Amino acid sequence: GPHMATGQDRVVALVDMDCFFVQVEQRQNPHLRNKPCAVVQYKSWKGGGIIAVSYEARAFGVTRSMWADDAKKLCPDLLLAQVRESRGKANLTKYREASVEVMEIMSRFAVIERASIDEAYVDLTSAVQERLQKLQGQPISADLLPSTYIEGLPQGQKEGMRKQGLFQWLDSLQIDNLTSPDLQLTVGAVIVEEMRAAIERETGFQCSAGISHNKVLAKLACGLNKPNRQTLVSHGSVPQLFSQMPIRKIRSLGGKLGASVIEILGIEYMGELTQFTESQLQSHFGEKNGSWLYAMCRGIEHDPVKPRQLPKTIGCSKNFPGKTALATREQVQWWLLQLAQELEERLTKDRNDNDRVATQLVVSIRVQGDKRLSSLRRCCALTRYDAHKMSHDAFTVIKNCNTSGTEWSPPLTMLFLCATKFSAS
DNA sequence: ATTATGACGCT
Protein backbone atom coordinates (compact mmCIF):
# COMPACT_ATOMS: atom_id res chain seq x y z
CA GLY A 1 0.00 0.00 0.00
CA PRO A 2 1.96 3.01 1.28
CA HIS A 3 5.20 1.36 0.09
CA MET A 4 4.25 0.26 -3.44
CA ALA A 5 6.36 2.68 -5.46
CA THR A 6 4.32 3.65 -8.48
CA GLY A 7 7.05 4.70 -10.91
CA GLN A 8 5.86 8.30 -10.85
CA ASP A 9 9.16 10.05 -9.94
CA ARG A 10 9.99 11.12 -13.53
CA VAL A 11 8.33 13.09 -16.30
CA VAL A 12 9.30 11.62 -19.68
CA ALA A 13 8.23 12.56 -23.20
CA LEU A 14 8.68 10.79 -26.52
CA VAL A 15 8.75 13.12 -29.54
CA ASP A 16 8.13 11.64 -32.98
CA MET A 17 8.62 13.79 -36.09
CA ASP A 18 5.48 12.94 -38.08
CA CYS A 19 6.55 11.11 -41.27
CA PHE A 20 9.86 12.89 -40.98
CA PHE A 21 11.43 12.27 -44.39
CA VAL A 22 8.20 13.40 -46.07
CA GLN A 23 8.21 16.58 -43.98
CA VAL A 24 11.85 17.32 -44.91
CA GLU A 25 11.03 16.95 -48.62
CA GLN A 26 7.83 19.04 -48.12
CA ARG A 27 9.71 21.88 -46.48
CA GLN A 28 12.18 21.76 -49.40
CA ASN A 29 9.45 21.47 -52.08
CA PRO A 30 6.29 23.47 -51.23
CA HIS A 31 4.40 21.77 -54.09
CA LEU A 32 4.23 18.67 -51.87
CA ARG A 33 2.74 20.18 -48.73
CA ASN A 34 -0.71 19.11 -47.51
CA LYS A 35 -0.95 16.50 -50.26
CA PRO A 36 -0.73 12.72 -50.32
CA CYS A 37 2.98 12.21 -50.76
CA ALA A 38 5.63 9.67 -49.82
CA VAL A 39 9.39 9.25 -49.94
CA VAL A 40 10.94 6.49 -52.08
CA GLN A 41 14.38 4.89 -52.33
CA TYR A 42 15.36 3.81 -55.85
CA LYS A 43 12.70 3.69 -58.64
CA SER A 44 13.51 0.83 -61.06
CA TRP A 45 12.13 -2.16 -59.12
CA LYS A 46 8.34 -1.59 -58.99
CA GLY A 47 8.75 2.22 -58.74
CA GLY A 48 11.01 2.00 -55.71
CA GLY A 49 10.43 1.30 -52.05
CA ILE A 50 8.32 3.72 -50.07
CA ILE A 51 9.91 4.46 -46.70
CA ALA A 52 7.82 7.37 -45.32
CA VAL A 53 4.22 8.46 -45.92
CA SER A 54 2.28 11.65 -45.27
CA TYR A 55 -0.96 11.35 -43.33
CA GLU A 56 -2.94 12.36 -46.39
CA ALA A 57 -1.40 9.43 -48.24
CA ARG A 58 -1.84 7.08 -45.25
CA ALA A 59 -5.58 7.77 -45.44
CA PHE A 60 -5.40 5.98 -48.82
CA GLY A 61 -3.76 2.88 -47.33
CA VAL A 62 -0.24 3.84 -48.40
CA THR A 63 2.29 2.38 -45.99
CA ARG A 64 6.00 2.26 -45.56
CA SER A 65 7.76 -0.77 -47.00
CA MET A 66 5.45 -0.92 -50.01
CA TRP A 67 6.33 -0.61 -53.67
CA ALA A 68 5.69 2.78 -55.22
CA ASP A 69 3.73 1.30 -58.16
CA ASP A 70 1.41 -0.43 -55.67
CA ALA A 71 1.02 2.78 -53.64
CA LYS A 72 0.05 4.58 -56.83
CA LYS A 73 -2.60 1.90 -57.32
CA LEU A 74 -4.04 2.84 -53.93
CA CYS A 75 -3.52 6.57 -54.44
CA PRO A 76 -3.15 7.75 -58.04
CA ASP A 77 -2.57 11.38 -57.04
CA LEU A 78 0.26 10.29 -54.73
CA LEU A 79 3.26 12.57 -55.02
CA LEU A 80 6.70 11.02 -54.49
CA ALA A 81 9.98 12.57 -53.35
CA GLN A 82 13.12 10.54 -53.98
CA VAL A 83 15.99 9.84 -51.60
CA ARG A 84 19.31 11.26 -52.80
CA GLU A 85 21.57 8.74 -54.55
CA SER A 86 25.33 9.00 -54.12
CA ARG A 87 28.03 6.51 -55.16
CA GLY A 88 25.25 4.24 -56.31
CA LYS A 89 23.41 4.01 -52.98
CA ALA A 90 20.87 5.89 -50.91
CA ASN A 91 22.41 8.86 -49.09
CA LEU A 92 20.37 9.97 -46.08
CA THR A 93 22.41 13.10 -45.36
CA LYS A 94 19.54 15.57 -45.85
CA TYR A 95 17.48 13.83 -43.14
CA ARG A 96 20.37 13.38 -40.70
CA GLU A 97 21.00 17.13 -40.96
CA ALA A 98 17.30 17.98 -40.59
CA SER A 99 17.16 15.66 -37.57
CA VAL A 100 20.17 17.34 -35.97
CA GLU A 101 18.37 20.70 -36.40
CA VAL A 102 15.36 19.35 -34.51
CA MET A 103 17.44 17.63 -31.82
CA GLU A 104 19.38 20.80 -31.10
CA ILE A 105 16.16 22.74 -30.54
CA MET A 106 14.82 19.96 -28.26
CA SER A 107 18.01 20.09 -26.22
CA ARG A 108 17.30 23.72 -25.26
CA PHE A 109 14.42 22.56 -23.09
CA ALA A 110 15.49 19.27 -21.52
CA VAL A 111 18.00 16.47 -21.89
CA ILE A 112 17.24 14.27 -24.89
CA GLU A 113 18.06 10.69 -25.91
CA ARG A 114 18.22 10.25 -29.65
CA ALA A 115 16.39 6.97 -30.14
CA SER A 116 16.21 7.28 -33.90
CA ILE A 117 16.62 9.86 -36.64
CA ASP A 118 12.95 10.88 -36.19
CA GLU A 119 12.35 10.39 -32.50
CA ALA A 120 13.84 11.34 -29.18
CA TYR A 121 13.07 10.77 -25.54
CA VAL A 122 13.01 13.74 -23.18
CA ASP A 123 13.66 13.68 -19.44
CA LEU A 124 11.52 16.60 -18.20
CA THR A 125 11.85 16.00 -14.44
CA SER A 126 14.27 18.84 -13.68
CA ALA A 127 12.55 21.19 -16.12
CA VAL A 128 9.14 20.54 -14.49
CA GLN A 129 10.45 21.32 -11.02
CA GLU A 130 11.96 24.54 -12.41
CA ARG A 131 8.63 25.47 -14.01
CA LEU A 132 6.61 24.49 -10.90
CA GLN A 133 8.65 26.85 -8.75
CA LYS A 134 8.31 29.51 -11.48
CA LEU A 135 4.56 29.18 -11.07
CA GLN A 136 4.21 29.48 -7.29
CA GLY A 137 0.83 27.81 -7.36
CA GLN A 138 -0.93 29.47 -10.26
CA PRO A 139 -3.39 27.12 -11.98
CA ILE A 140 -2.52 25.83 -15.41
CA SER A 141 -4.71 27.34 -18.12
CA ALA A 142 -6.14 25.26 -20.95
CA ASP A 143 -4.62 27.92 -23.23
CA LEU A 144 -1.22 26.51 -22.31
CA LEU A 145 -2.23 23.09 -23.73
CA PRO A 146 -3.69 23.82 -27.18
CA SER A 147 -2.75 20.48 -28.76
CA THR A 148 -2.78 18.16 -25.71
CA TYR A 149 -5.09 15.17 -25.31
CA ILE A 150 -5.63 13.59 -21.89
CA GLU A 151 -6.01 9.86 -22.44
CA GLY A 152 -9.12 8.40 -20.85
CA LEU A 153 -10.91 11.76 -20.84
CA PRO A 154 -13.67 12.82 -21.17
CA GLN A 155 -15.47 10.15 -19.16
CA GLY A 156 -19.08 10.32 -17.95
CA GLN A 157 -16.24 17.48 -33.14
CA LYS A 158 -12.84 15.91 -32.34
CA GLU A 159 -11.40 19.22 -31.15
CA GLY A 160 -14.50 19.67 -29.00
CA MET A 161 -13.85 16.32 -27.33
CA ARG A 162 -10.19 17.20 -26.75
CA LYS A 163 -11.27 20.42 -25.03
CA GLN A 164 -13.82 18.52 -22.89
CA GLY A 165 -11.18 16.03 -21.78
CA LEU A 166 -8.64 18.74 -21.04
CA PHE A 167 -11.25 20.71 -19.07
CA GLN A 168 -12.10 17.69 -16.94
CA TRP A 169 -8.41 17.04 -16.29
CA LEU A 170 -7.58 20.64 -15.37
CA ASP A 171 -10.67 21.03 -13.19
CA SER A 172 -9.70 17.98 -11.15
CA LEU A 173 -6.13 19.27 -10.84
CA GLN A 174 -4.58 20.13 -7.46
CA ILE A 175 -2.19 22.96 -8.32
CA ASP A 176 -1.32 23.53 -4.64
CA ASN A 177 0.47 20.17 -4.18
CA LEU A 178 3.78 20.68 -6.01
CA THR A 179 4.43 16.94 -5.46
CA SER A 180 1.40 15.45 -7.24
CA PRO A 181 2.63 13.42 -10.24
CA ASP A 182 -0.47 14.49 -12.24
CA LEU A 183 0.52 18.13 -11.81
CA GLN A 184 4.08 17.22 -12.81
CA LEU A 185 2.84 15.47 -15.97
CA THR A 186 0.72 18.50 -16.77
CA VAL A 187 3.62 20.90 -16.49
CA GLY A 188 5.69 18.50 -18.56
CA ALA A 189 2.98 18.71 -21.21
CA VAL A 190 3.01 22.49 -21.11
CA ILE A 191 6.77 22.39 -21.69
CA VAL A 192 6.26 19.87 -24.49
CA GLU A 193 3.79 22.25 -26.19
CA GLU A 194 6.47 24.96 -25.96
CA MET A 195 9.09 22.52 -27.31
CA ARG A 196 6.90 21.51 -30.23
CA ALA A 197 6.01 25.15 -30.86
CA ALA A 198 9.70 26.03 -31.02
CA ILE A 199 10.48 23.05 -33.29
CA GLU A 200 7.75 24.09 -35.73
CA ARG A 201 8.64 27.81 -35.60
CA GLU A 202 12.31 27.21 -36.14
CA THR A 203 12.25 24.24 -38.53
CA GLY A 204 8.73 24.09 -39.90
CA PHE A 205 8.55 20.46 -38.81
CA GLN A 206 5.53 19.15 -36.96
CA CYS A 207 5.67 16.34 -34.47
CA SER A 208 3.59 14.30 -32.11
CA ALA A 209 4.59 13.68 -28.52
CA GLY A 210 3.65 11.49 -25.61
CA ILE A 211 4.04 12.63 -22.00
CA SER A 212 3.97 10.12 -19.17
CA HIS A 213 6.21 8.82 -16.36
CA ASN A 214 8.53 6.56 -18.37
CA LYS A 215 9.69 5.80 -21.88
CA VAL A 216 7.33 2.97 -22.76
CA LEU A 217 4.25 4.88 -21.67
CA ALA A 218 5.53 8.02 -23.36
CA LYS A 219 5.96 6.12 -26.65
CA LEU A 220 2.54 4.48 -26.37
CA ALA A 221 0.94 7.85 -25.53
CA CYS A 222 2.59 9.55 -28.50
CA GLY A 223 1.00 7.03 -30.84
CA LEU A 224 -2.53 7.69 -29.56
CA ASN A 225 -3.21 11.07 -31.28
CA LYS A 226 -1.27 11.81 -34.48
CA PRO A 227 -0.35 13.95 -36.37
CA ASN A 228 0.65 17.24 -34.74
CA ARG A 229 -0.84 16.36 -31.34
CA GLN A 230 0.48 15.36 -27.95
CA THR A 231 -1.05 12.97 -25.44
CA LEU A 232 -0.63 12.86 -21.68
CA VAL A 233 -0.97 9.35 -20.23
CA SER A 234 -1.33 9.62 -16.48
CA HIS A 235 -0.43 6.84 -14.08
CA GLY A 236 -4.14 6.61 -13.25
CA SER A 237 -5.20 6.05 -16.86
CA VAL A 238 -3.05 2.90 -17.20
CA PRO A 239 -5.57 0.19 -16.06
CA GLN A 240 -8.22 1.24 -18.59
CA LEU A 241 -5.74 1.95 -21.40
CA PHE A 242 -3.95 -1.34 -20.89
CA SER A 243 -7.24 -3.24 -20.50
CA GLN A 244 -7.75 -3.35 -24.30
CA MET A 245 -4.16 -2.66 -25.44
CA PRO A 246 -2.75 -5.50 -27.59
CA ILE A 247 0.51 -6.69 -26.07
CA ARG A 248 2.26 -6.15 -29.40
CA LYS A 249 1.66 -2.39 -29.16
CA ILE A 250 4.11 -1.87 -26.24
CA ARG A 251 7.68 -1.04 -27.20
CA SER A 252 9.78 -4.24 -27.42
CA LEU A 253 6.79 -6.60 -27.34
CA GLY A 254 6.11 -6.21 -31.07
CA GLY A 255 8.12 -9.26 -32.09
CA LYS A 256 8.95 -12.74 -30.88
CA LEU A 257 8.86 -12.04 -27.13
CA GLY A 258 5.42 -10.45 -27.39
CA ALA A 259 4.20 -13.38 -29.48
CA SER A 260 5.51 -15.82 -26.88
CA VAL A 261 3.87 -13.82 -24.05
CA ILE A 262 0.58 -14.09 -25.92
CA GLU A 263 0.98 -17.81 -26.64
CA ILE A 264 2.41 -19.03 -23.32
CA LEU A 265 0.15 -17.03 -20.99
CA GLY A 266 -2.94 -17.31 -23.21
CA ILE A 267 -3.62 -13.56 -23.09
CA GLU A 268 -4.23 -10.73 -25.62
CA TYR A 269 -3.96 -7.41 -23.73
CA MET A 270 -1.27 -5.75 -21.62
CA GLY A 271 -3.49 -5.54 -18.54
CA GLU A 272 -4.04 -9.29 -18.35
CA LEU A 273 -0.37 -9.41 -17.36
CA THR A 274 -1.17 -8.03 -13.90
CA GLN A 275 -2.64 -11.39 -12.85
CA PHE A 276 0.77 -13.11 -12.77
CA THR A 277 3.35 -12.90 -10.03
CA GLU A 278 6.79 -11.52 -10.81
CA SER A 279 8.20 -15.02 -10.24
CA GLN A 280 5.81 -16.56 -12.80
CA LEU A 281 6.79 -14.02 -15.46
CA GLN A 282 10.48 -14.52 -14.71
CA SER A 283 9.99 -18.27 -15.04
CA HIS A 284 8.42 -17.96 -18.49
CA PHE A 285 10.57 -15.19 -19.97
CA GLY A 286 13.75 -14.86 -17.94
CA GLU A 287 14.64 -12.77 -14.93
CA LYS A 288 15.09 -9.41 -16.68
CA ASN A 289 12.11 -9.73 -19.02
CA GLY A 290 9.90 -11.05 -16.22
CA SER A 291 10.72 -8.18 -13.86
CA TRP A 292 10.28 -5.68 -16.71
CA LEU A 293 6.90 -7.18 -17.61
CA TYR A 294 5.68 -7.29 -14.01
CA ALA A 295 6.45 -3.62 -13.57
CA MET A 296 5.41 -2.51 -17.05
CA CYS A 297 1.90 -3.98 -16.99
CA ARG A 298 1.39 -1.83 -13.88
CA GLY A 299 2.70 1.19 -15.79
CA ILE A 300 6.15 1.12 -14.22
CA GLU A 301 9.41 1.16 -16.12
CA HIS A 302 12.83 2.24 -14.95
CA ASP A 303 14.81 2.48 -18.22
CA PRO A 304 16.39 5.95 -17.98
CA VAL A 305 16.50 8.65 -20.59
CA LYS A 306 20.14 8.49 -21.56
CA PRO A 307 21.62 11.93 -22.23
CA ARG A 308 22.86 11.13 -25.71
CA GLN A 309 21.93 13.55 -28.47
CA LEU A 310 24.32 11.94 -30.99
CA PRO A 311 24.35 8.50 -32.66
CA LYS A 312 26.64 5.92 -31.05
CA THR A 313 27.57 4.38 -34.43
CA ILE A 314 27.94 5.66 -38.01
CA GLY A 315 26.83 3.15 -40.61
CA CYS A 316 26.74 2.57 -44.35
CA SER A 317 24.59 -0.23 -45.69
CA LYS A 318 23.36 -1.53 -49.02
CA ASN A 319 21.29 -4.57 -49.88
CA PHE A 320 21.93 -6.25 -53.23
CA PRO A 321 18.70 -8.20 -53.68
CA GLY A 322 17.60 -10.56 -56.42
CA LYS A 323 19.92 -10.70 -59.39
CA THR A 324 21.85 -7.59 -58.31
CA ALA A 325 23.75 -9.75 -55.78
CA LEU A 326 27.52 -9.32 -55.98
CA ALA A 327 29.25 -12.26 -57.66
CA THR A 328 32.72 -11.00 -58.63
CA ARG A 329 35.72 -9.82 -56.64
CA GLU A 330 35.74 -6.57 -58.62
CA GLN A 331 32.11 -5.95 -57.62
CA VAL A 332 32.67 -6.61 -53.93
CA GLN A 333 35.70 -4.33 -53.94
CA TRP A 334 34.04 -1.46 -55.82
CA TRP A 335 31.04 -1.49 -53.51
CA LEU A 336 33.17 -1.82 -50.38
CA LEU A 337 34.92 1.25 -51.76
CA GLN A 338 31.68 3.17 -52.34
CA LEU A 339 30.54 2.36 -48.79
CA ALA A 340 33.91 3.25 -47.26
CA GLN A 341 33.85 6.53 -49.18
CA GLU A 342 30.47 7.58 -47.82
CA LEU A 343 31.60 6.37 -44.38
CA GLU A 344 34.77 8.50 -44.61
CA GLU A 345 32.74 11.61 -45.57
CA ARG A 346 30.33 11.20 -42.67
CA LEU A 347 33.11 10.30 -40.19
CA THR A 348 35.13 13.41 -41.04
CA LYS A 349 31.99 15.54 -40.69
CA ASP A 350 31.33 13.81 -37.35
CA ARG A 351 34.85 14.34 -35.99
CA ASN A 352 34.65 18.04 -36.83
CA ASP A 353 31.10 18.51 -35.52
CA ASN A 354 31.21 16.43 -32.37
CA ASP A 355 34.88 16.04 -31.32
CA ARG A 356 35.26 12.27 -31.40
CA VAL A 357 36.93 9.54 -33.45
CA ALA A 358 35.66 6.05 -34.11
CA THR A 359 38.11 3.22 -33.48
CA GLN A 360 36.45 0.00 -34.61
CA LEU A 361 35.16 -0.85 -38.07
CA VAL A 362 32.41 -3.44 -38.25
CA VAL A 363 31.96 -5.30 -41.55
CA SER A 364 28.74 -7.25 -42.00
CA ILE A 365 27.68 -9.16 -45.08
CA ARG A 366 24.80 -11.37 -46.14
CA VAL A 367 25.39 -14.20 -48.61
CA GLN A 368 22.67 -15.13 -51.05
CA GLY A 369 20.17 -17.63 -49.70
CA ASP A 370 21.16 -17.19 -46.06
CA LYS A 371 18.19 -17.11 -43.70
CA ARG A 372 19.86 -14.56 -41.39
CA LEU A 373 19.91 -10.82 -42.18
CA SER A 374 23.58 -10.78 -41.15
CA SER A 375 25.47 -13.80 -42.46
CA LEU A 376 28.68 -12.50 -40.90
CA ARG A 377 29.83 -9.63 -38.69
CA ARG A 378 33.57 -9.20 -38.10
CA CYS A 379 35.28 -6.20 -36.51
CA CYS A 380 38.71 -4.79 -37.27
CA ALA A 381 40.66 -1.74 -36.16
CA LEU A 382 39.69 1.71 -37.49
CA THR A 383 42.88 3.75 -37.25
CA ARG A 384 42.54 6.28 -40.07
CA TYR A 385 39.52 7.93 -41.69
CA ASP A 386 40.64 6.71 -45.11
CA ALA A 387 38.19 5.15 -47.56
CA HIS A 388 40.66 2.96 -49.46
CA LYS A 389 42.17 1.64 -46.25
CA MET A 390 38.76 0.94 -44.69
CA SER A 391 37.51 -0.82 -47.83
CA HIS A 392 40.73 -2.84 -48.16
CA ASP A 393 40.53 -3.91 -44.50
CA ALA A 394 36.86 -4.77 -44.93
CA PHE A 395 37.81 -7.01 -47.83
CA THR A 396 40.74 -8.53 -45.91
CA VAL A 397 38.24 -9.29 -43.16
CA ILE A 398 35.52 -10.92 -45.31
CA LYS A 399 37.48 -12.48 -48.19
CA ASN A 400 37.62 -15.95 -46.60
CA CYS A 401 33.87 -16.18 -47.31
CA ASN A 402 34.40 -16.58 -51.08
CA THR A 403 34.18 -20.32 -51.89
CA SER A 404 35.20 -20.20 -55.57
CA GLY A 405 38.44 -21.07 -57.35
CA THR A 406 38.13 -13.76 -59.11
CA GLU A 407 34.51 -14.91 -58.80
CA TRP A 408 32.47 -14.49 -55.57
CA SER A 409 30.16 -17.25 -54.32
CA PRO A 410 27.61 -17.52 -52.78
CA PRO A 411 26.95 -14.03 -54.17
CA LEU A 412 26.59 -11.27 -51.60
CA THR A 413 23.16 -9.73 -50.95
CA MET A 414 24.32 -7.16 -48.38
CA LEU A 415 27.34 -5.05 -47.53
CA PHE A 416 27.56 -3.05 -44.32
CA LEU A 417 30.34 -0.93 -42.79
CA CYS A 418 29.85 0.51 -39.32
CA ALA A 419 32.18 2.79 -37.40
CA THR A 420 31.71 2.21 -33.68
CA LYS A 421 33.57 2.66 -30.38
CA PHE A 422 33.88 6.43 -30.35
CA SER A 423 36.36 8.23 -28.14
CA ALA A 424 36.56 11.96 -27.42
CA SER A 425 38.94 13.56 -29.90
C1' DA B 1 12.99 -7.39 -54.08
C1' DT B 2 10.18 -3.23 -47.57
C1' DT B 3 15.84 -0.10 -47.08
C1' DA B 4 18.85 1.95 -44.37
C1' DT B 5 19.91 2.50 -40.69
C1' DG B 6 20.28 2.47 -35.34
C1' DA B 7 19.89 0.66 -30.38
C1' DC B 8 20.41 -2.97 -27.32
C1' DG B 9 20.66 -7.91 -25.25
C1' DC B 10 22.86 -12.55 -24.85
C1' DT B 11 26.57 -15.48 -24.40
Side-chain angles (χ1 to χ4, degrees), chain A residues 1-129 131-135 137-156 159-162 164-425:
Chain A
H3 299 115
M4 294 270 93
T6 68
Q8 281 176 291
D9 43 318
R10 298 177 298 155
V11 181
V12 174
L14 183 273
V15 178
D16 188 304
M17 321 305 313
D18 302 327
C19 50
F20 182 45
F21 286 28
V22 167
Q23 280 197 83
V24 171
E25 302 294 334
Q26 280 178 145
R27 179 178 73 175
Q28 183 188 313
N29 186 346
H31 288 325
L32 300 180
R33 300 176 179 185
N34 306 293
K35 275 127 194 182
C37 65
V39 171
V40 280
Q41 294 181 318
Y42 315 123
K43 208 87 200 39
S44 301
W45 185 270
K46 314 199 178 189
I50 288 177
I51 56 174
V53 195
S54 79
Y55 279 74
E56 297 85 341
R58 289 182 197 198
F60 287 86
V62 185
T63 77
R64 66 178 269 285
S65 276
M66 150 205 285
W67 295 121
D69 297 349
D70 294 334
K72 276 285 200 178
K73 301 175 187 159
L74 296 167
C75 180
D77 265 16
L78 178 64
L79 304 177
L80 300 175
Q82 247 189 281
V83 176
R84 174 185 293 130
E85 233 157 293
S86 294
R87 320 192 183 69
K89 65 179 293 301
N91 171 0
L92 305 176
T93 298
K94 192 193 310 186
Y95 320 105
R96 289 198 184 92
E97 290 179 351
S99 172
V100 161
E101 291 181 68
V102 167
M103 295 302 182
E104 291 186 338
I105 298 160
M106 291 175 77
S107 293
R108 299 213 306 267
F109 295 78
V111 323
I112 70 150
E113 174 186 345
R114 179 201 205 274
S116 88
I117 186 162
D118 58 23
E119 79 195 359
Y121 293 91
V122 186
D123 200 332
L124 294 156
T125 321
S126 286
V128 161
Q129 329 276 27
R131 195 74 176 272
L132 267 177
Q133 269 91 299
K134 260 206 74 42
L135 295 168
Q138 45 252 12
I140 281 139
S141 148
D143 291 350
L144 304 178
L145 296 162
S147 56
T148 302
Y149 285 76
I150 308 294
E151 174 63 28
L153 297 187
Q155 143 264 319
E159 178 71 15
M161 304 271 295
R162 184 201 73 85
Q164 283 194 266
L166 186 60
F167 284 174
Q168 293 194 355
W169 175 257
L170 291 176
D171 284 328
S172 90
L173 236 199
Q174 48 175 321
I175 174 58
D176 59 316
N177 185 4
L178 292 212
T179 78
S180 172
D182 289 349
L183 180 49
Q184 288 158 14
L185 284 187
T186 305
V187 177
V190 170
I191 299 179
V192 174
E193 296 266 18
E194 292 156 0
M195 176 184 297
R196 290 180 46 245
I199 291 170
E200 184 170 12
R201 188 180 75 74
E202 302 179 28
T203 69
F205 296 138
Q206 293 176 353
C207 56
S208 297
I211 310 105
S212 189
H213 289 294
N214 52 67
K215 296 162 83 153
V216 160
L217 289 191
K219 171 77 168 145
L220 185 59
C222 178
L224 299 182
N225 292 285
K226 301 165 126 149
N228 199 32
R229 305 307 197 227
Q230 60 187 61
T231 303
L232 179 154
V233 163
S234 66
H235 178 78
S237 75
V238 167
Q240 286 246 83
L241 177 74
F242 278 8
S243 82
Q244 300 187 92
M245 190 54 79
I247 282 155
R248 71 178 160 280
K249 299 300 208 224
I250 272 74
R251 158 153 92 52
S252 76
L253 300 185
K256 279 181 226 208
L257 171 67
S260 80
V261 168
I262 281 163
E263 177 165 34
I264 285 164
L265 304 184
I267 61 180
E268 300 171 70
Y269 308 116
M270 210 46 201
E272 295 183 77
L273 273 164
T274 68
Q275 290 327 118
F276 302 93
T277 66
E278 193 171 2
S279 302
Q280 284 183 307
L281 296 173
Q282 286 175 318
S283 69
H284 289 299
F285 314 114
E287 158 191 317
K288 189 269 145 173
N289 289 335
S291 286
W292 185 87
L293 284 168
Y294 185 78
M296 180 90 250
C297 70
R298 298 168 169 77
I300 298 176
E301 202 236 357
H302 305 294
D303 187 28
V305 176
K306 310 183 171 192
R308 189 193 67 244
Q309 203 194 323
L310 306 175
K312 182 163 327 185
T313 63
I314 296 188
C316 291
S317 161
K318 181 168 171 44
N319 294 353
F320 300 91
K323 63 93 162 174
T324 57
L326 318 187
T328 88
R329 150 194 256 160
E330 271 313 72
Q331 254 186 318
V332 174
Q333 298 185 333
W334 192 83
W335 281 109
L336 284 172
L337 182 54
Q338 302 321 294
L339 287 196
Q341 284 179 221
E342 160 171 9
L343 189 57
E344 195 205 305
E345 210 162 47
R346 288 163 58 190
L347 279 169
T348 287
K349 176 66 168 239
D350 185 78
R351 181 180 49 202
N352 293 331
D353 278 341
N354 302 310
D355 310 314
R356 61 184 190 164
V357 295
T359 66
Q360 169 175 92
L361 181 73
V362 172
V363 193
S364 190
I365 66 82
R366 191 148 102 108
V367 317
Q368 168 182 86
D370 184 319
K371 55 174 176 66
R372 332 212 291 295
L373 304 84
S374 179
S375 301
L376 172 166
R377 248 191 272 171
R378 304 280 202 253
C379 84
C380 68
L382 180 37
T383 62
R384 321 171 74 100
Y385 284 1
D386 179 279
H388 283 99
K389 161 141 184 92
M390 298 201 258
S391 49
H392 177 218
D393 293 349
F395 200 92
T396 297
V397 152
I398 45 88
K399 75 207 189 39
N400 79 75
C401 282
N402 183 25
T403 67
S404 92
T406 88
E407 222 83 11
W408 199 291
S409 153
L412 301 191
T413 52
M414 182 261 288
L415 293 181
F416 178 73
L417 292 186
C418 192
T420 74
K421 265 60 179 321
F422 284 87
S423 167
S425 165

